[PDB]
Design a protein around this nucleic acid. Sequence first.
RNA 1: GAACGAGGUAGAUGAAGAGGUCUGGAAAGGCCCGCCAUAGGAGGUAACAGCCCUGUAGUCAAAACUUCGUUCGA
RNA 2: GACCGAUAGUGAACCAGUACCGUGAGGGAAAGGUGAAAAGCACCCCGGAAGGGGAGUGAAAGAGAUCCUGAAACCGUGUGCCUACAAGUAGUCAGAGCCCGUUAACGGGUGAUGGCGUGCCUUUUGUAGAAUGAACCGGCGAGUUACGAUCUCGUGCAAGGUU
RNA 3: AACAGUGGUAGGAGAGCGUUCUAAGGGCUGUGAAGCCAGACCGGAAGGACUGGUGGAGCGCUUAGAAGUGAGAAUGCCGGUA
Lengths: 205, 146, 101
Amino acid sequence: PKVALYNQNGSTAGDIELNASVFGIEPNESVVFDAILMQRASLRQGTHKVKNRSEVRGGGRKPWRQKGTGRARQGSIRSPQWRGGGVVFGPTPRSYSYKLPKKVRRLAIKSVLSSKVIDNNIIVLEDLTLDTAKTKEMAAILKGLSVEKKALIVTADANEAVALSARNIPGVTVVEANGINVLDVVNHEKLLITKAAVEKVEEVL
Amino acid sequence: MKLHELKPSEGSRKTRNRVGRGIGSGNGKTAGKGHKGQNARSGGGVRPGFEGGQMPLFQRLPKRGFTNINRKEYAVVNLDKLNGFAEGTEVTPELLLETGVISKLNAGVKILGNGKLEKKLTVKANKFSASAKEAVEAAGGTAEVI
Amino acid sequence: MHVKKGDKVMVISGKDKGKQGTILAAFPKKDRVLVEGVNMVKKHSKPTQANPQGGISNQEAPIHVSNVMPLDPKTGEVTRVGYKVEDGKKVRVAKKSGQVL
RNA sequence: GAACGAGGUAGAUGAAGAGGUCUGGAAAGGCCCGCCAUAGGAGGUAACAGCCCUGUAGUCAAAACUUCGUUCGA
RNA sequence: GACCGAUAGUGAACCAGUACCGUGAGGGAAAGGUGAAAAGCACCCCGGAAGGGGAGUGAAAGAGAUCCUGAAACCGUGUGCCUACAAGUAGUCAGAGCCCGUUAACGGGUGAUGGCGUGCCUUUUGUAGAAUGAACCGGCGAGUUACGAUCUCGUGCAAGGUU
RNA sequence: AACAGUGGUAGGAGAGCGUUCUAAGGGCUGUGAAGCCAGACCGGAAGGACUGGUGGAGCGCUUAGAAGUGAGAAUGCCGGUA
C-alpha cells in the first residue's frame, strides 16, 4: 500500500500510503468469483415467454371420436406433439437476481482492489482537473500515462466535466466514487483513481 | 482475477441430473421411477401423511391441551454472558439491546444462573432465578428486580 | 439527398471508381442515381411497338447514391457537403470550401 | 374570465480519410499511414465503415391546436 | 432483451381470421429467400406450342421465375466383382479367385465355399415369438419454473447471523 | 511397485461427450466461413480432427455461465416418397 503518485502530464510525486485494511488484504479467489457471478447474472433482464398449451388460440373440440377410427386417439389440435404447437416447460418471465451478505460484498470489493494493487496496475492520479469537454485532451492524458488497454477512471468531483470527454474514447468508462463494483473494476484491467476518491472510498470501506 | 480464467470454489458446483435421456446415464425409459406404479405417473404422488387407508398415526393418536393468548416469554440471558461487561457497570435492557446480547426484548429480560461470574455490577432485569440472584450477590453486585 | 439532378459528380465505389460524370436522373423513392458512362448494362431488346428493331442496347443503369459524392467547384477534388443559408434560400456548400453547390 | 415559462405534435443545423497499397466482380477486408470524437447509437452503402449516405452527441425551431405553474373570525 | 428466426415466433412475416368446412353458433389452414443492379435471356436452330440446344448478360445460367444451400426416403443410367442344384433375421469369422491402389497400413471393393447365428421396442416369471408398435425419410415431440421445506457440498462471519 | 477386482434388469453414486446463446482472452474467415457430399485418420465412449468436391458470408478455440440441450418406437403430428 505504497503505490506511487502521478500528475496529469505523467510527472510522479511522492508515493501515497493506502489503507492496508482495504488494499493489502489477501484477495479471496472464491468470494471474487461469486461476486462477479452475482451482478453478472442480475444484469440480465430475463424477459421471455412461450405460449403454453392453454393459450394457443384454439384447441377445444375433440378432433375425432375416441374409438372406431384408424388414427391415434387424440385431444385438441393445439397439443405438444402436434405441428400446431404449444410448447411444454418453456421459458417464462423470471428474475435472475438475488442478494449477498454485506460482509461478503465488502470482502469482494476489497479483494479485487487489493488484487489490482499487488499486480501493480493501480495508478493514483491526484486532482484530475480538466477545463473542457474535449476528448483528445484526455486521450493525450492517457497516452502520457501509457494507458493502452481498457481502463476505469473514478474522479468524484470532475465527473461532471470529465465524463463527456471520456465516455466515447474508446470503451473506457468514467464512474463516480460510489459506482465501483466488481465487474466494472475487473473488466477494465487498469484503474485510474484520484486522491480525493482514494480517501473517500477508504472512508466508505 | 481476470474473467478469462474464472474458476469456481471446487466442490460448490454440480451439473443437473437430466433424467430421462438415453440409457447410458441410467434413468432411461423409466426415468428412474419404476414400472407402472401410481408413483410412476405425473402428479401420481399421495398425501404426505397418507398410509394406504390404514388410518394415519396422527389421527390414531389423541389431542393434547390448550394454548392461550397470555404468555410472558422472557429473553433468557445467562450469567456467562454478563462477564463481557466491564467492572462496576450498570446493565439494563436498553443497554443489552445495543450490545446485542438480546435481539428481542420480548416480555422482558430474565437472568439465569448458568456460568461463572466475578465482577461488580448493578443488574436491572425483569426477573431473576434463585441461583442467579445469589450468584450475582456473591459476585458483589445487587440483584434489584424491575 | 446531397446530390441533385444536373450536377457534376464523381463516383466512389464499384468497378467504376472516381470517374468524372454529369447527372441526369434521380430516384429518391429508393435512393438511386444515374451517371453517364457508369454501369453500362447491355440490355436485350425485343421491338417496341412499330420499332422494327432487334438489337443489343448499351445504356446507363442507376447506382446507389451512397457510392456518389460531388466535387469542390474551386479545387476540383472530391469532397463532402454542407448546408448553409445565403440570403433567404438555403444552398449547398461543400466542406473545406466556401463556394456553393 | 388574460399575458407569461416548459414541453407535445411537422422539422432545422450537425466533426473527421474516394489516404496509399494487395486480393477481389465489387473494399467497409489485409499491410502501411492520417484525422474527429459532448458524435465509437442504428441502418444502408456491389463484402465487416467513428471519418461514404441517412443520421448520431450537442444546439435551435411553431403560423395553428394541445398539457402543465403565476395574475382576478374568537 | 444470455426472447423466436419461417413445423419456430401471433392462427396470420406472404392481400388471414382469407381460402375451405358447417344451415348456425363456430371451426380454421398452407404459402418467406433470382440477382448488387433485370442487366430477366437480342439473335439462330428442333418444335404447333411447352420444352430444349446454341449465342449474350452477369462474379456465378449447375442463377432462368419454389429462383440462395439443396440432405434422406424414392426413382434412373453406365459400369469393377459375383450370381440359373440352391432354400437361410441376410450378418459376422474363416476364406481362394478377380479387380483397384490409401488420411500408407500387419491396404480398399467384390467375394465361390465352411463354422455360428430366431430383428428392434414395450410388457412380462417367460417373447424368435402365432402378444403389442413402427410402410420408409426429414423435422417437431416429454421430469422444468416460481414460492417454501429439508439434507449434502462451498463460501463470509461466527455465540451470533441477517435484512 | 505389489495384491485384488472389473456379467447385470429395477435402482443409487461418480466421471465425462456434444448442442444454442451469453461474458472475458486469444484469432479463423472472399488467398472461400457456415452448411452439405466423399475419404483407407485420432480417442476408452459419447465423439474430434485432417484432405478433397460443393457452397458463397459469416465462425471455431480457451475459461466460466444459462438452458426450449441430444429420439427409434407413443395405432404420435406435419411434409415428402414408396
